[PDB]
Design a binder for these strands. Sequence first.
DNA 1: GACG
DNA 2: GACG
Lengths: 220, 215
Amino acid sequence: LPHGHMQTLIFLDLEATGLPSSRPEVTELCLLAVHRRALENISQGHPPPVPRPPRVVDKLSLCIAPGKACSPGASEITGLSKAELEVQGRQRFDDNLAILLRAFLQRQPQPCCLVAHNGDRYDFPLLQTELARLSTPSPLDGTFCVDSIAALKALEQASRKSYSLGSIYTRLYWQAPTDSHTAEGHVLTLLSICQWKPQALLQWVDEHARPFSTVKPMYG
Amino acid sequence: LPHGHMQTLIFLDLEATGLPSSRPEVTELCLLAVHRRALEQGHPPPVPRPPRVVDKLSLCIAPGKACSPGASEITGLSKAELEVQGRQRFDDNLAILLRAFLQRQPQPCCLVAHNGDRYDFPLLQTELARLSTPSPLDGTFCVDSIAALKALEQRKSYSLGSIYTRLYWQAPTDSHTAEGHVLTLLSICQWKPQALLQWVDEHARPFSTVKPMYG
DNA sequence: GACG
DNA sequence: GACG
Ligand SMILES: [Ca+2]
Ligand SMILES: [Ca+2]
């Protein structure tokens, strides 16, 4: 066990202004914190039902004004735009936001592990970049992270498929994901797939977790 | 009139150990913050769409005492299980969390809760008074959604589910979680949004003046 | 009433 | 890929 046992899985999703090469800026952030026990506590039916979210969960979802415009594809994919976020008086990614995250993370049983779909290549690096702009320390220096793409690959294989979020979900449950437009929608889809084999999901997390502090920024 | 235009409405629901006479404690809290521009037919109207741009908080909270049998049934929460999954009490750090969430909202902000004048507002105040640090809410306003809807409806029940079903002809989606209750409340308040805002602005009062439920 |  |  690299860093022992993670008592909390925090499912994470960021919506943003664009894809990596565009030096994107977060526009929406969702966190769903789950005690590992909530994720242990058998599917019946065909096709296999979408699992019940555990009762005990902490949830945080925030809209964030970016400093640059949303690319057309981001804006269509999210239903968000820079002008709208300002009209609705959203604030930039700031130190206060970091305090909010800090306090939220602190409310969870340590050690905590962030889980995001393609997180090692998207969410984690971009979140690293956002916090670096800030005049405060990172609230995640003690937090851990793993990528759920590598997780379900090593899970299905235990027994030419895409491993995009929506593809894995429709593979498993034969339904379209309920919400594809919001950060929370992405996190709930992520949670359902991660509930497919909770037992083994956890085992794999506990052994592949790595310090968030070792994630390299998306851009400088 | 009295405190200017509210810029943020925060929809609030508390799950707890019991009804007021049991001197209950919070077991779950949900905040849903919506800018006033997000608000500002027919027969029945469909259930309104929640605005795209929202801030949302939902936390489970370990109470100091057991849930009454009745509260456990309708909330799916128990002290034992909240403890098994390592929830923290209503503590100082929760206040820090709450304060940061709130200061991400454009002021002035108004708390909106259903029967909030008799239940959520005094219960929250009782919870907050218990802490060492100052209340992160003393700058905030509040209003009860029950009166609002009595006023906006032009003898029958004004419970959450009753208004909702009289308006949209459907049962609420989720009556078992704080988030569920907040969403039902939001739909209710989205029925006549401008009229609702109207009534909130006029009736907003300081949350500093809300009397603790007990203690 | 109506709130857990 | 796969993330917006
Ligand atoms: Ca994503
Ligand atoms: Ca309530």
